[PDB]
Amino acid sequence: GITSYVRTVLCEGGVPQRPVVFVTRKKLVNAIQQKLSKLKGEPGWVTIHGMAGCGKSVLAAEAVRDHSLLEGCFPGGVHWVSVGKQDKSGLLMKLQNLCTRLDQDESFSQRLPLNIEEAKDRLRILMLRKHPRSLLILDDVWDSWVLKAFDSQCQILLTTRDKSVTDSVMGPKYVVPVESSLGKEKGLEILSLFVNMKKADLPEQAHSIIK
Amino acid sequence: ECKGSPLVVSLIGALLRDFPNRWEYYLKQLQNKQFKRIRKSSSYDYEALDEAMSISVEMLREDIKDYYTDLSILQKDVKVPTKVLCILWDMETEEVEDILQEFVNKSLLFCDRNGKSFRYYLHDLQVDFLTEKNCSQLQDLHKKIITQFQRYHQPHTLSPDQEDCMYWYNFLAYHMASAKMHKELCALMFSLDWIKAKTELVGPAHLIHEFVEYRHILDEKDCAVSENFQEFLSLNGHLLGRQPFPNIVQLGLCEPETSEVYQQAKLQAKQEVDNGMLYLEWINKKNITNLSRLVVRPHTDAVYHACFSEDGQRI
Ligand SMILES: Nc1ncnc2c1ncn2[C@H]1C[C@H](O)[C@@H](COP(=O)(O)OP(=O)(O)OP(=O)(O)O)O1
Ligand SMILES: [Mg+2]
DSSP: OOOOOHHHHHHHHHOOOOOOOOOOOOHHHHHHHHHHOOOOSSSOEEEEEEESSHHHHHHHHHHHHHHHHHHHHSOOOOEEEEEEEEHHHHHHHHHHHHHHHHSSSSOOOSSSSHHHHHHHHHHHHIIIITTTOOOOEEEEEOOOHHHHOOOOOOOOEEEOOSSSTTOOSSEEEEEEOSSOOOHHHHHHHHHHHHHHHSTTTTOOOHHHOOO | OOOOOHHHHHHHHHHHHHOOHHHHHHHHHHHHHHHSSSOOOOOOSSSSSHHHHHHHHSSSSHHHHHHHGGGGGTTTTTTHHHHHHHHHHTTOOOHHHHHHHHHHHTTTTTTTBBBSEEEBBOOOHHHHHHHHHHHHHHHHHHHHHHHHHHSSOOTTTOOOSTTTTTHHHHHHHHHHHHHOOHHHHHHHHOOOHHHHHHHHTTTTTTHHHHHHHHHHSOOOOHHHHHHHHHHHHTTTTHHSSSSOOHHHHSSSSSSOOOTTTHHHHHHHHHHHHOOOOOOOOOOOOGGGGOOOOOOOOSSSSOOOOOOOOOOOOOE
């Protein structure tokens, strides 16, 4: 049960809304969230990983989707960044864009840094004062210097495919590892939603394809 | 092996986080002495410990840079008297110290302010890096130092007062081995008088230790000569050190067979004899003495007890 307020914080954050055809993974979401709860304060990084298309992002979106962990724990808003895969130049822009996003007031200089580190300063400072209890989520990430760039000393959680990526970084690191499996009961649940029929009404063919 | 470079410990330690089972492997790996095997991504800015040292070496001005390599030859744990560095360099002493002072600042060579004398030396890690990065040269240079010493003091021309000489006893023997020059090695270690002076201030243990190293270096046939000499030493330990270093040349003519040690003695005796010295020949050796393998006098004062190490390595 999403609170109306949760959506309001989430909209500001910019996390994608969950696909209309989804199926909770209560145990997994619960684990990330309880673990996610763990770094109550002081920096910290969380890595989530799986072979391609394991529900890795949706869980990240889903975990924060809940009110309890987020509201009591996280007075700071949540900011989502879609890192992707980047050459050094490309990475630079994302940083400026995060700069513009975070500084809604514009009190900070309209001029944007031409240097990565300066952006790192704007992030750290902004996280430190402007958004004291903020959590940053990342999407993908394929090389370490990238997290080197985002290494603001403020909690950022990166979700990915390589688990090697967060080795440059410093501070407590925890990993929740998503095996690509799912549940036969659940997929039937998912298939039903996809074709809109009582699960039993589903044809004999359906059972086998899920295998 | 770590020698306290916390970078090595974290480097080994993290390395183990992944593979708890391969515990011995890295042990033997560091026993290997190569650091190319150990690598971890880390907060620290380098894949490995070898990685750090390379960064330090580059900065030195080209004129200085060549010199460090010469510095490579020096033992892991020897505080060498400045002079020997002067000799290899062939550069005057007031000057030589200062370049080394610049190194010490580069933190690539630790200082030793013992009295007027200065002994510089390295960390085990620093030494290991050198062989790792300078090994091909080292065999070649090993022959450079010796020739320079030849341009100065001869081993017989060596003296007790000179500061450098003990390094020269203790380790000159060492350099020739790397040199791989066995005939020169014969020119030095064999010399009985060199043994005399060495046993005069060194004692009769270092030579034995050198000999074991010596055996691989030269020839199997000589090895017998070394076997004959070791046999000549067996009689040395018990009374040789005292003081009245009894004219060995006279006490030497006691060995059996002949070998190379006995051959030397008879000729020496013949040389002595015409001049005088009233040496008395001995005619019964083959008929007498069941020789013990070794004798030790640890104390001028009567022994009361002795015990083997449980390992058996020492007593
Ligand atoms: N309830 C659900 N949980 C997880 N995935 C779902 C669900 N319902 C549908 N899906 C499908 C549709 C989406 O395309 C996909 C979710 O994408 P996601 O798990 O974020 O992949 P990903 O982002 O880890 O891939 P990549 O590793 O390429 O980034 O799974
Ligand atoms: Mg993704």
